[PDB]
Short mmCIF file of C-alpha atoms and ligand atoms in Angstrom, two decimals:
data_model
loop_
_atom_site.label_atom_id
_atom_site.label_comp_id
_atom_site.label_asym_id
_atom_site.label_seq_id
_atom_site.Cartn_x
_atom_site.Cartn_y
_atom_site.Cartn_z
CA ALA A 1 -33.17 -33.93 -66.75
CA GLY A 2 -30.32 -34.60 -69.26
CA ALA A 3 -28.28 -31.85 -71.04
CA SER A 4 -29.67 -28.85 -72.94
CA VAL A 5 -28.82 -27.43 -76.42
CA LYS A 6 -26.01 -24.81 -76.11
CA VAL A 7 -27.06 -21.50 -77.80
CA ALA A 8 -24.68 -18.68 -78.89
CA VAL A 9 -25.70 -15.57 -80.90
CA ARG A 10 -23.28 -13.40 -82.92
CA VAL A 11 -23.68 -9.91 -84.47
CA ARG A 12 -21.38 -8.88 -87.37
CA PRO A 13 -20.28 -5.49 -88.75
CA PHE A 14 -22.63 -3.70 -91.16
CA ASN A 15 -22.41 -5.25 -94.69
CA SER A 16 -22.61 -3.24 -98.00
CA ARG A 17 -26.46 -3.29 -98.15
CA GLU A 18 -26.65 -1.83 -94.62
CA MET A 19 -24.09 0.98 -95.28
CA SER A 20 -25.93 1.88 -98.54
CA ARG A 21 -29.11 2.60 -96.47
CA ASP A 22 -27.05 4.39 -93.70
CA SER A 23 -28.29 1.66 -91.30
CA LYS A 24 -27.81 2.32 -87.54
CA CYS A 25 -26.93 -0.32 -84.89
CA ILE A 26 -29.98 -1.69 -82.92
CA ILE A 27 -28.04 -4.55 -81.19
CA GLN A 28 -26.24 -4.25 -77.81
CA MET A 29 -24.42 -7.03 -75.85
CA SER A 30 -23.16 -7.37 -72.24
CA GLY A 31 -21.78 -10.68 -70.93
CA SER A 32 -24.23 -13.39 -72.18
CA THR A 33 -27.04 -10.85 -72.73
CA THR A 34 -28.31 -9.47 -76.13
CA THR A 35 -30.64 -6.41 -76.30
CA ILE A 36 -32.50 -5.29 -79.50
CA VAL A 37 -34.09 -1.82 -80.00
CA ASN A 38 -37.20 -1.55 -82.22
CA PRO A 39 -36.10 1.34 -84.55
CA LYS A 40 -39.72 1.64 -85.88
CA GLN A 41 -41.26 2.29 -82.40
CA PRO A 42 -38.14 3.84 -80.75
CA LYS A 43 -40.52 4.39 -77.73
CA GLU A 44 -40.99 0.63 -77.03
CA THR A 45 -39.02 -1.00 -74.18
CA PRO A 46 -35.96 -2.75 -75.75
CA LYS A 47 -36.24 -6.60 -75.69
CA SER A 48 -33.32 -8.47 -73.98
CA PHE A 49 -32.31 -12.14 -74.36
CA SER A 50 -29.84 -14.30 -72.34
CA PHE A 51 -27.79 -17.08 -74.07
CA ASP A 52 -24.77 -19.35 -73.32
CA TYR A 53 -22.75 -16.69 -75.31
CA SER A 54 -23.69 -13.25 -76.77
CA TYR A 55 -20.68 -12.64 -79.16
CA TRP A 56 -20.08 -8.96 -80.08
CA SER A 57 -18.30 -8.93 -83.50
CA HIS A 58 -19.80 -5.53 -84.63
CA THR A 59 -16.34 -3.96 -84.85
CA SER A 60 -12.93 -5.11 -86.21
CA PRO A 61 -10.53 -7.67 -84.68
CA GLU A 62 -8.22 -4.68 -83.87
CA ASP A 63 -10.69 -3.98 -81.02
CA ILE A 64 -10.57 -5.83 -77.64
CA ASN A 65 -14.32 -6.77 -77.31
CA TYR A 66 -14.41 -8.26 -80.91
CA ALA A 67 -15.44 -11.97 -80.63
CA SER A 68 -12.87 -13.68 -82.97
CA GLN A 69 -13.10 -16.89 -85.07
CA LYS A 70 -10.67 -18.42 -82.47
CA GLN A 71 -12.87 -17.45 -79.48
CA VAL A 72 -16.07 -18.84 -81.03
CA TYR A 73 -14.30 -22.07 -82.10
CA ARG A 74 -12.68 -22.41 -78.61
CA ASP A 75 -16.04 -21.86 -76.78
CA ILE A 76 -18.31 -24.35 -78.73
CA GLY A 77 -15.99 -25.87 -81.40
CA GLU A 78 -13.53 -27.39 -78.82
CA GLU A 79 -16.33 -28.34 -76.38
CA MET A 80 -18.13 -30.41 -79.08
CA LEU A 81 -14.80 -31.87 -80.41
CA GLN A 82 -13.87 -32.93 -76.79
CA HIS A 83 -17.36 -34.60 -76.54
CA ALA A 84 -16.62 -36.50 -79.83
CA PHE A 85 -13.44 -37.85 -78.10
CA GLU A 86 -15.61 -38.92 -75.03
CA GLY A 87 -17.59 -41.00 -77.67
CA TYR A 88 -20.64 -38.67 -78.12
CA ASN A 89 -22.29 -37.67 -81.45
CA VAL A 90 -22.25 -33.84 -81.76
CA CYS A 91 -23.97 -31.14 -83.88
CA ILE A 92 -23.36 -27.41 -84.40
CA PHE A 93 -25.77 -25.68 -86.82
CA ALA A 94 -25.55 -22.02 -87.99
CA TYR A 95 -29.05 -20.39 -88.01
CA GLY A 96 -30.13 -16.93 -89.27
CA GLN A 97 -31.17 -14.39 -91.94
CA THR A 98 -29.42 -14.50 -95.34
CA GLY A 99 -26.38 -12.18 -94.90
CA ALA A 100 -26.32 -12.47 -91.03
CA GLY A 101 -23.02 -14.46 -90.80
CA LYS A 102 -23.90 -18.23 -90.89
CA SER A 103 -21.23 -19.35 -93.44
CA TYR A 104 -18.53 -16.93 -92.12
CA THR A 105 -19.12 -18.57 -88.68
CA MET A 106 -19.13 -22.22 -89.99
CA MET A 107 -16.60 -21.92 -92.92
CA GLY A 108 -14.94 -18.48 -92.66
CA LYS A 109 -12.73 -17.15 -95.50
CA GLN A 110 -9.38 -19.02 -95.04
CA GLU A 111 -7.30 -15.94 -95.97
CA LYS A 112 -5.74 -15.22 -92.55
CA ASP A 113 -7.20 -16.70 -89.31
CA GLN A 114 -10.64 -15.99 -90.94
CA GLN A 115 -11.16 -19.83 -90.75
CA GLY A 116 -14.59 -20.75 -89.31
CA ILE A 117 -15.65 -23.55 -86.89
CA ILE A 118 -15.58 -26.42 -89.50
CA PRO A 119 -12.00 -25.81 -90.77
CA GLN A 120 -10.78 -25.17 -87.17
CA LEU A 121 -12.44 -28.36 -85.84
CA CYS A 122 -10.73 -30.34 -88.68
CA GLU A 123 -7.33 -28.76 -87.77
CA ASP A 124 -7.92 -29.58 -84.08
CA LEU A 125 -9.27 -33.15 -84.70
CA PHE A 126 -6.22 -34.12 -86.85
CA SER A 127 -3.82 -32.13 -84.58
CA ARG A 128 -5.00 -34.12 -81.44
CA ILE A 129 -4.83 -37.47 -83.38
CA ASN A 130 -1.17 -36.97 -84.48
CA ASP A 131 -0.17 -35.87 -80.92
CA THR A 132 -1.29 -39.39 -79.68
CA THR A 133 1.64 -41.42 -78.18
CA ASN A 134 -0.42 -44.42 -76.92
CA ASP A 135 0.58 -47.02 -79.61
CA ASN A 136 -2.54 -49.05 -78.57
CA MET A 137 -4.61 -46.07 -79.96
CA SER A 138 -5.30 -45.95 -83.75
CA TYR A 139 -7.89 -43.75 -85.60
CA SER A 140 -10.32 -43.60 -88.58
CA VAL A 141 -11.87 -40.35 -89.98
CA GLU A 142 -14.74 -40.48 -92.56
CA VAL A 143 -16.33 -37.28 -94.06
CA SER A 144 -19.69 -36.70 -95.83
CA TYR A 145 -20.61 -33.28 -97.32
CA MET A 146 -24.12 -32.73 -98.77
CA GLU A 147 -26.49 -29.91 -99.86
CA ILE A 148 -30.29 -29.97 -99.26
CA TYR A 149 -31.85 -27.56 -101.86
CA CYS A 150 -35.67 -27.64 -102.30
CA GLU A 151 -36.00 -30.97 -100.38
CA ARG A 152 -33.53 -32.72 -102.80
CA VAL A 153 -30.09 -33.93 -101.54
CA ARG A 154 -26.85 -33.75 -103.61
CA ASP A 155 -23.30 -35.16 -102.86
CA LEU A 156 -20.78 -32.22 -102.71
CA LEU A 157 -17.80 -34.66 -102.55
CA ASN A 158 -19.13 -36.36 -105.76
CA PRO A 159 -20.40 -33.61 -108.15
CA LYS A 160 -20.41 -35.81 -111.34
CA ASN A 161 -23.14 -37.91 -109.54
CA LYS A 162 -26.38 -35.91 -110.28
CA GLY A 163 -28.42 -38.31 -108.06
CA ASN A 164 -31.35 -36.79 -106.19
CA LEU A 165 -30.16 -39.14 -103.40
CA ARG A 166 -33.01 -40.76 -101.41
CA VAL A 167 -33.38 -40.16 -97.64
CA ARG A 168 -34.20 -43.58 -96.22
CA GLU A 169 -35.28 -44.74 -92.78
CA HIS A 170 -33.24 -47.78 -91.69
CA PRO A 171 -35.83 -50.08 -90.00
CA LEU A 172 -33.56 -50.31 -86.86
CA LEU A 173 -30.81 -47.55 -86.99
CA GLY A 174 -32.88 -44.52 -88.22
CA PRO A 175 -32.32 -42.21 -91.21
CA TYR A 176 -29.38 -42.29 -93.71
CA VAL A 177 -28.64 -40.91 -97.22
CA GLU A 178 -28.51 -43.82 -99.75
CA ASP A 179 -25.17 -44.05 -101.68
CA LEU A 180 -23.64 -40.91 -100.08
CA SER A 181 -19.82 -40.64 -100.36
CA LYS A 182 -18.11 -41.65 -97.09
CA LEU A 183 -14.41 -40.80 -97.81
CA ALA A 184 -11.62 -41.99 -95.46
CA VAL A 185 -9.21 -39.06 -94.78
CA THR A 186 -5.79 -39.13 -93.03
CA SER A 187 -4.65 -35.45 -93.24
CA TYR A 188 -6.18 -31.98 -92.47
CA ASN A 189 -4.91 -30.78 -95.93
CA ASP A 190 -6.79 -33.79 -97.40
CA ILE A 191 -10.09 -32.86 -95.61
CA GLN A 192 -9.43 -29.17 -96.61
CA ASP A 193 -9.29 -30.00 -100.37
CA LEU A 194 -12.63 -31.90 -100.05
CA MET A 195 -14.67 -29.15 -98.24
CA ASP A 196 -13.00 -26.69 -100.70
CA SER A 197 -14.45 -28.62 -103.74
CA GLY A 198 -17.60 -29.36 -101.64
CA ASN A 199 -18.28 -25.58 -101.24
CA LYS A 200 -17.62 -24.92 -105.00
CA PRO A 201 -20.23 -27.56 -105.89
CA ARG A 202 -23.03 -25.79 -103.86
CA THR A 203 -26.14 -24.62 -105.84
CA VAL A 204 -25.39 -21.03 -107.07
CA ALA A 205 -28.34 -18.61 -107.57
CA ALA A 206 -28.61 -15.62 -109.95
CA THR A 207 -30.83 -14.17 -107.14
CA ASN A 208 -27.72 -13.99 -104.76
CA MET A 209 -25.82 -12.58 -107.84
CA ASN A 210 -24.65 -16.19 -108.64
CA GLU A 211 -23.33 -16.75 -105.05
CA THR A 212 -24.37 -19.87 -103.05
CA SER A 213 -28.19 -20.10 -102.81
CA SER A 214 -29.54 -18.78 -99.46
CA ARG A 215 -32.16 -21.64 -99.78
CA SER A 216 -29.55 -24.47 -99.60
CA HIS A 217 -28.59 -26.23 -96.30
CA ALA A 218 -24.95 -27.54 -96.05
CA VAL A 219 -24.42 -30.61 -93.75
CA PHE A 220 -20.76 -31.56 -93.14
CA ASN A 221 -20.48 -34.94 -91.29
CA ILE A 222 -17.37 -36.62 -89.81
CA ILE A 223 -17.63 -40.28 -88.67
CA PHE A 224 -14.80 -40.47 -86.07
CA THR A 225 -13.67 -44.00 -85.08
CA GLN A 226 -11.17 -44.55 -82.19
CA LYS A 227 -9.49 -48.02 -82.00
CA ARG A 228 -7.98 -49.21 -78.63
CA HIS A 229 -5.85 -52.43 -79.03
CA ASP A 230 -5.42 -54.47 -75.77
CA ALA A 231 -2.18 -56.64 -75.82
CA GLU A 232 -3.28 -59.09 -73.04
CA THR A 233 -6.52 -60.09 -74.92
CA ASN A 234 -5.69 -58.73 -78.45
CA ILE A 235 -9.30 -57.35 -78.72
CA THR A 236 -9.57 -53.88 -80.36
CA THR A 237 -12.46 -51.73 -78.94
CA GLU A 238 -13.98 -48.93 -81.09
CA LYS A 239 -15.42 -45.49 -80.20
CA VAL A 240 -17.64 -44.13 -83.04
CA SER A 241 -18.80 -40.47 -82.75
CA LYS A 242 -20.63 -38.61 -85.56
CA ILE A 243 -19.95 -34.83 -85.83
CA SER A 244 -22.69 -32.90 -87.75
CA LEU A 245 -21.68 -29.35 -88.89
CA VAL A 246 -24.62 -27.50 -90.48
CA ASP A 247 -24.89 -24.17 -92.41
CA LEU A 248 -28.68 -23.66 -92.78
CA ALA A 249 -30.75 -21.83 -95.43
CA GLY A 250 -31.87 -18.20 -94.82
CA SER A 251 -34.33 -18.12 -91.88
CA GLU A 252 -36.64 -15.38 -93.40
CA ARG A 253 -40.12 -16.83 -94.30
CA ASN A 254 -42.44 -26.55 -100.70
CA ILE A 255 -38.76 -25.40 -101.09
CA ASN A 256 -38.61 -23.68 -97.64
CA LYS A 257 -40.50 -26.76 -96.30
CA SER A 258 -37.16 -27.78 -94.65
CA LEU A 259 -36.71 -24.49 -92.70
CA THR A 260 -40.36 -23.88 -91.69
CA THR A 261 -40.35 -27.51 -90.31
CA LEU A 262 -37.14 -26.84 -88.29
CA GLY A 263 -39.04 -23.98 -86.57
CA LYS A 264 -42.09 -26.15 -85.73
CA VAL A 265 -39.65 -28.88 -84.42
CA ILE A 266 -37.51 -26.48 -82.25
CA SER A 267 -40.83 -24.98 -80.95
CA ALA A 268 -42.42 -28.41 -80.12
CA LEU A 269 -39.23 -29.47 -78.19
CA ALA A 270 -39.18 -26.06 -76.37
CA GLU A 271 -42.77 -26.61 -75.07
CA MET A 272 -42.10 -30.03 -73.44
CA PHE A 273 -46.23 -35.33 -82.02
CA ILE A 274 -42.83 -33.99 -83.33
CA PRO A 275 -42.74 -33.44 -87.16
CA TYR A 276 -39.12 -34.65 -87.69
CA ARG A 277 -40.20 -36.27 -91.03
CA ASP A 278 -42.31 -33.36 -92.44
CA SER A 279 -38.94 -32.31 -94.01
CA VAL A 280 -35.65 -33.90 -95.16
CA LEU A 281 -33.54 -31.75 -92.75
CA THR A 282 -35.49 -32.34 -89.51
CA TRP A 283 -35.57 -36.05 -90.61
CA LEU A 284 -31.77 -36.52 -91.22
CA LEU A 285 -31.12 -34.59 -87.95
CA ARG A 286 -33.94 -36.24 -85.90
CA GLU A 287 -31.19 -37.46 -83.48
CA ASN A 288 -29.14 -34.20 -83.26
CA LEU A 289 -32.36 -32.28 -82.46
CA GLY A 290 -33.92 -34.03 -79.40
CA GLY A 291 -31.97 -37.35 -79.43
CA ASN A 292 -28.57 -39.10 -78.93
CA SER A 293 -26.38 -35.99 -79.65
CA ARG A 294 -24.73 -32.94 -77.96
CA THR A 295 -26.01 -29.97 -80.04
CA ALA A 296 -25.16 -26.23 -80.28
CA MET A 297 -26.96 -23.46 -82.25
CA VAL A 298 -25.02 -20.35 -83.38
CA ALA A 299 -27.58 -17.72 -84.51
CA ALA A 300 -26.05 -15.01 -86.81
CA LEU A 301 -27.49 -11.48 -86.34
CA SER A 302 -27.58 -8.37 -88.56
CA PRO A 303 -26.72 -5.25 -86.51
CA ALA A 304 -28.92 -3.19 -88.89
CA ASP A 305 -32.21 -1.39 -88.03
CA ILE A 306 -33.57 -2.46 -91.49
CA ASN A 307 -33.42 -6.18 -90.37
CA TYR A 308 -35.32 -5.67 -87.06
CA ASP A 309 -38.15 -8.26 -87.58
CA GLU A 310 -35.90 -10.97 -89.13
CA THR A 311 -33.27 -10.29 -86.41
CA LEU A 312 -36.01 -10.37 -83.66
CA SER A 313 -37.32 -13.68 -85.11
CA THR A 314 -33.78 -15.22 -84.99
CA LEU A 315 -33.52 -14.16 -81.32
CA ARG A 316 -36.90 -15.74 -80.37
CA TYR A 317 -35.90 -19.04 -82.16
CA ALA A 318 -32.47 -18.99 -80.44
CA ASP A 319 -34.23 -18.40 -77.05
CA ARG A 320 -36.68 -21.31 -77.67
CA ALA A 321 -33.71 -23.54 -78.80
CA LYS A 322 -32.19 -22.90 -75.30
CA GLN A 323 -35.07 -25.04 -73.73
CA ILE A 324 -34.37 -28.29 -75.76
CA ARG A 325 -33.09 -31.37 -73.80
CA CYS A 326 -30.69 -33.82 -75.54
CA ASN A 327 -30.53 -37.54 -74.47
CA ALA A 328 -26.89 -38.18 -75.61
CA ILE A 329 -25.06 -41.39 -74.43
CA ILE A 330 -21.44 -42.68 -74.93
CA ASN A 331 -20.82 -45.03 -77.90
CA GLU A 332 -20.14 -48.18 -75.74
CA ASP A 333 -18.26 -51.22 -77.20
CA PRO A 334 -19.59 -54.19 -75.10
CA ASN A 335 -16.00 -55.63 -75.37
CA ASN A 336 -14.51 -53.32 -72.63
CA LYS A 337 -16.54 -55.29 -70.00
CA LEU A 338 -15.39 -58.58 -71.72
CA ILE A 339 -11.68 -57.44 -71.58
CA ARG A 340 -12.09 -56.55 -67.81
CA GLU A 341 -13.18 -60.16 -66.81
CA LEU A 342 -10.98 -62.34 -69.08
CA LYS A 343 -7.75 -60.43 -68.14
CA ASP A 344 -8.54 -60.54 -64.39
CA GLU A 345 -9.49 -64.26 -64.81
CA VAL A 346 -5.96 -64.86 -66.24
CA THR A 347 -4.05 -62.92 -63.49
CA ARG A 348 -5.89 -64.41 -60.37
CA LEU A 349 -5.12 -67.73 -62.21
CA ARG A 350 -1.33 -66.95 -61.61
CA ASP A 351 -1.62 -66.77 -57.73
N1 ADP B 1 -18.29 -11.88 -87.52
C1 ADP B 1 -18.05 -11.42 -88.75
N2 ADP B 1 -16.91 -10.71 -88.96
C2 ADP B 1 -16.68 -10.22 -90.19
N3 ADP B 1 -17.40 -10.35 -91.29
C3 ADP B 1 -18.52 -11.05 -91.05
C4 ADP B 1 -18.91 -11.61 -89.85
N4 ADP B 1 -20.12 -12.27 -89.98
C5 ADP B 1 -20.44 -12.10 -91.23
N5 ADP B 1 -19.51 -11.38 -91.95
C6 ADP B 1 -19.59 -11.01 -93.36
O1 ADP B 1 -20.96 -10.89 -93.68
C7 ADP B 1 -21.17 -11.30 -95.05
C8 ADP B 1 -22.28 -12.32 -95.09
O2 ADP B 1 -21.78 -13.67 -95.36
P1 ADP B 1 -22.46 -14.68 -94.36
O3 ADP B 1 -22.87 -13.86 -93.20
O4 ADP B 1 -21.60 -15.88 -94.12
O5 ADP B 1 -23.81 -15.12 -95.07
P2 ADP B 1 -25.03 -15.93 -94.43
O6 ADP B 1 -25.39 -15.32 -93.16
O7 ADP B 1 -26.12 -15.80 -95.44
O8 ADP B 1 -24.55 -17.32 -94.24
C9 ADP B 1 -19.79 -11.73 -95.59
O9 ADP B 1 -19.23 -10.65 -96.34
C10 ADP B 1 -19.00 -12.04 -94.32
O10 ADP B 1 -17.60 -11.92 -94.54
MG1 MG B 2 -23.54 -18.97 -95.93
#
C-alpha cells in the first residue's frame, strides 16, 4: 500500500459548437462528486462518480462556485511542485475529449490570470528558488518540450531539427528520447519564451481549422536539481526531481495507438502483463504511470448533452485511474549519510 494517483475532473462552459446545437447541461457537481444525466434515455438513473476534486467551471469567474485557474493550480499544481522539492518525480496529465478543456487547464491563455497549471508551476518553481536565503542552497532547472504525433516524436524547443527522434530503452535507467534538447533556464520569463515557441511549433491540422492537432500529445518536462553545499566537509549533495506535464490527444476512439494503449495501461493497473511499450507515450511515461512518480490526472469534461458518450467514457477512465498505486521514492544522494559520519568523527575528535 503506497500512494494512489490523484484524480480531478473539470467541466467548462458551453463552447461555440454546443451553443449552435442549443446544447443543455447534463453535468452536476457537489463537493468531490460528479453526476451525469443520459439525455438520450432521460428515464435512466443518473450515474455519479467521486474524485479527489470535481471542479465546477460551467459558469464565469464572476460567480462564487467557479473553479478558477488559481484554485486548480493550488490544489494539484502546488502539491506536485512541493513533492518535487521533497525530491520526488511528479506527473500531471490532462485527459479528455477534443474541446473538453485539456490545454486551457495545462497551458491556459496568458491574457489575464487565464494561465494554466504549466505556466503557474513555472512561476511558482522560480518564485520559491529566488526566495531561498540558505547560501548553501543552489539550483539547476532543465526543460524538455516534445510532441508525439502518430507515434513520431518532435523537439518543440528545436523546430529546425526535423528528426523523428528515437525512443530508446537505456539498459539500466529505462526510456529516454535520443538527442532531445535539455535547455538550462534561470528565469520564469526565459522558460515562458520557450513554451511559447514550443506551443507554436505543435503540429497544426486543417481538420481543427489549422489549430493544434487533437491527435498530438504535448509532454513538458523539467529536470529540477537542488545543490546543498556543506562547509565542514565541502561535499555538495544533489536532489534531482523530474516534473512531467502532459496535454494528451483527444480521448474519442496506428496513429491513435498511443491513446488506445494508455487506456489498456490505466485499466490493467486499475485491476491489480502491462503494455507500457505497445506505444511511445505509455513507454516514455512507464515510470509516471505505475512507477517511481507522484501522478495526477485532470479529466476535462464537456457540459453538453451532445457529448454524453465521450463525456461518460472520460468519467469511467478517470474513475479507473483513481485505483492506480504509485511506488515513488525520494531521490537520495548517498553522500548525506557520508557527511553525517565524517563531521561527527571530526567533532568527537575535539573532546
Ligand atoms: N474552465 C474553462 N473556462 C473557460 N474556458 C474554458 C475552460 N475549459 C475550456 N475552455 C475553453 O474551451 C475551448 C477548448 O479548448 P481546450 O478545451 O483547451 O481544448 P482541448 O480540450 O481539446 O484541449 C477553448 O475555447 C477554451 O478557452
Ligand atoms: Mg489542447
